[PDB]
Write a protein that binds this DNA or RNA. Structure first.
Lengths: 116, 53, 113, 42
RNA sequence: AAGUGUCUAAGGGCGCAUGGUGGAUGCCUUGGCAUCGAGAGCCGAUGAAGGACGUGGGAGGCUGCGAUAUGCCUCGG
RNA sequence: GAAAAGUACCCCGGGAGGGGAGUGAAAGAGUACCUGAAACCGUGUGCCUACAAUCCGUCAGAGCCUCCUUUUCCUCUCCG
RNA sequence: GGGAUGAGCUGUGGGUAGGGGUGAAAGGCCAAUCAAACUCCGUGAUAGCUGGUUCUCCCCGAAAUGCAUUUAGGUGCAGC
RNA sequence: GGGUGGGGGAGUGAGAAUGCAGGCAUGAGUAGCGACAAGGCAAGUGAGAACCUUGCCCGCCGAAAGACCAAGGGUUCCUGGGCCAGGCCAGUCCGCCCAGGGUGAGUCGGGACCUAAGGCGAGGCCGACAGGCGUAGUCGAUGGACAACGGGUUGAUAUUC
RNA sequence: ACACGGGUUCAAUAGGUCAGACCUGGAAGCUCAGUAAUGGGUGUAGGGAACUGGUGCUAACCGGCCGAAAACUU
């Protein structure tokens, strides 16, 4: 991921790191994850890089994914099922879809999905 | 600073009228049921299903 | 000339300028075309406006004996309602007013093919 | 430091309480006044 | 070729028609103010005036009343 | 409102709110209620307005729409 | 930033009251306006000062000078 | 309920007083939405969910942003419903509205004990009256004796059951 | 904000993926030395953001709109 211009997500860059790692944790948990569209725009490259490591599959890839997602077990699933599931796709692991804007802020919502 | 004078209802109304609202709809979209006119933005989650209504 | 149904929401707690910015989006448009427009309008006064456009089309069907697929919104008003002045206390003991403006949406639908 | 008006039942009563208003003549006068006006007196 | 010729309405103004807001005007009144007339002209240690607390089948307020507590007894109508 | 006869019943609505029904002499009296001013806020409609300053009117004034109409007129005037 | 075992801070309860209190004094504080608090009363104080004074028309129609004045932005008399 | 004719009587006429009250405009859908602690993700309920509930992350305080008492408040406590008002938005929730329930002491803290400063003050001296000051005395804790601890419990009470 | 420019499956427009330019500076693991701190090997490692060029995997989605016809003269 190149950085983002403009104000980083959540609060500052640290909260953006935490947001991204949380969104990727729950993405590699459920596969289908709804956020607001700018969160998904920030997370799509980030998650696709993590899954690149997943389909690499070695202790260095595990140790460089655990440097983002603290959780040992969602990453067990990453380097167990989600990883090999992309035995073919070179790039293009996630997919954004448009949901209707959240009432209360009209925040453009989007559901990001592991391709399958 | 304050309004030095009140606004002639001409100007008042003339830019209460520049307080518009946007639009787009993509009519005739077959989904489960009778064709709903979801907007061109969302029609992928209209097709797939990830849209309320 | 026409068999034109009617409806009116009274004391919808939506301010009439915020309500008319949405009203201006069904000005003379097919009744279900207008409902399908106010479902996606974010303008968040679409709640009352769409509710009473659907109410007026229903009144057409059930009390004027007409068919939905012909109606077209003929008039939409957003008459004033009461205003319920709240008090908001501000900096340095000065106490300012906050109008709770509410509107009356008013729909009249027709039948003209 | 930053202080305005400190509530107390003891000082409120021991000064602006009935049993002290009737402890004098200007206070009996004041209770009389408020009973004339028709208040719920003190 | 040269010349003429309005149409437009994002929106404004004006006038009419149709509404809404608000609550003026009219017309009142379970309310006052001002007098006139006839009284009465003090109450309280036999506990006053004024109240708190309660009292009703059920919430409170006003009113009545006071642990006998919207009441008790006699005389009358 | 004289009287509560305060809108039973269906219809849209999650409710408020309305539509039709019905009460009432009147709903152009709906528990936001006698009559309902003006400011104010809209909807529509005739005119005008995007080369143009002008206490925002006044006078002169073409045109455009208006209802009203005399007739060339149609002699279907035995009906406009 | 100054003080921080002290002429320290703070709690509770209490006392001192308006020409008075208290004041390591500034005319500072005395319940968010203290060279005399606040409230009710005299009271509708009072001002030679400022503002305001509401419907129509018909006729007439000035003055801004003189003199005096604790008077000179008021007034009395005259003049008009 | 008013005409009009002759009369009587006026709180008789407003466009101004930085006039008074009500309503309603312009600014203007503009500022702001109350700290530089940080949120989300899945699920639920629901008409409707960024804010409500369950979870799991993640983050902030931790000489306080935790736990208690004193005053102060005065039911804000808990259960049930509600979402026509408020909550600087929305809310299905709420310290909101409505009903109903809830506060158990010989030992805790006060009065049934004591008193300091100080208040009142029989008689009393002084004052013109008003009143002032006060003796004996009686109040007055912020202080001095004084007898309960460990645990369990509920929707809400605990050295109280 | 709008605008402006590029692109929309005949696509290299963003993203991803690959090979680069660069930035850092010598990964992890395993191994060997060392009492150990730590140091050598695997090995310009490894990590990586914008820059370049590939590559049809993801998103550009079987679209909605608004748009002409002139009254005529020397």
């Amino acid at each position: 991921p190149k950085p983002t211009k403009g104000p980083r997500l959540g609060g500052s860059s640290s909260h953006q790191k935490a947001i991204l790692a949380n969104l990727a944790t729950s993405l590699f948990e459920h596969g289908r994850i709804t956020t607001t569209e700018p969160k998904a725009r920030a997370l799509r490259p980030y998650a696709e890089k993590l899954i690149t490591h997943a389909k690499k599959g070695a202790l260095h890839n595990r140790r460089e994914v655990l440097k983002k997602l603290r959780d040992k077990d969602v990453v067990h699933t990453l380097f167990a099922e989600i990883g090999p599931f992309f035995a073919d796709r070179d790039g293009g692991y996630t997919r954004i879809i448009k949901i209707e804007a959240r009432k209360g802020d009209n925040a453009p919502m989007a559901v990001i999905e592991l391709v399958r | 600073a304050v309004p030095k004078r009140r606004k002639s209802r001409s100007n008042t109304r003339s830019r209460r009228s520049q307080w518009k609202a946007a639009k787009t709809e993509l009519v005739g979209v077959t989904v489960a049921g009778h064709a709903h006119k979801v907007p061109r933005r969302l029609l992928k989650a209209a097709r797939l299903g990830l849209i309320d209504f | 000339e026409y068999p034109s149904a009617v409806a009116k929401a009274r004391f919808v707690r939506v301010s009439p300028r915020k309500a008319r910015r949405v009203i201006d989006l069904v000005r003379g448009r097919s009744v279900s075309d207008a409902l399908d427009i106010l479902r996606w309008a974010p303008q968040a006064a679409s709640g009352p406006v769409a509710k009473v456009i659907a109410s007026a089309a229903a009144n057409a069907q059930n009390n004027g004996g007409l068919d939905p697929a012909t109606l077209v919104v003929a008039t939409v008003y957003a008459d004033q309602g009461p205003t319920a002045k709240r008090i908001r206390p501000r900096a340095q003991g000065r106490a300012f007013r906050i109008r709770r403006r509410t509107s009356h949406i008013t729909v009249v639908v027709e039948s003209r093919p | 430091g930053k202080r305005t008006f400190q509530p107390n039942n003891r000082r409120r009563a021991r000064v602006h309480g009935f049993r002290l208003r009737m402890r004098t003549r200007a206070g009996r006068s004041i209770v009389s006044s408020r009973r004339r006006k028709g208040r719920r007196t003190l």
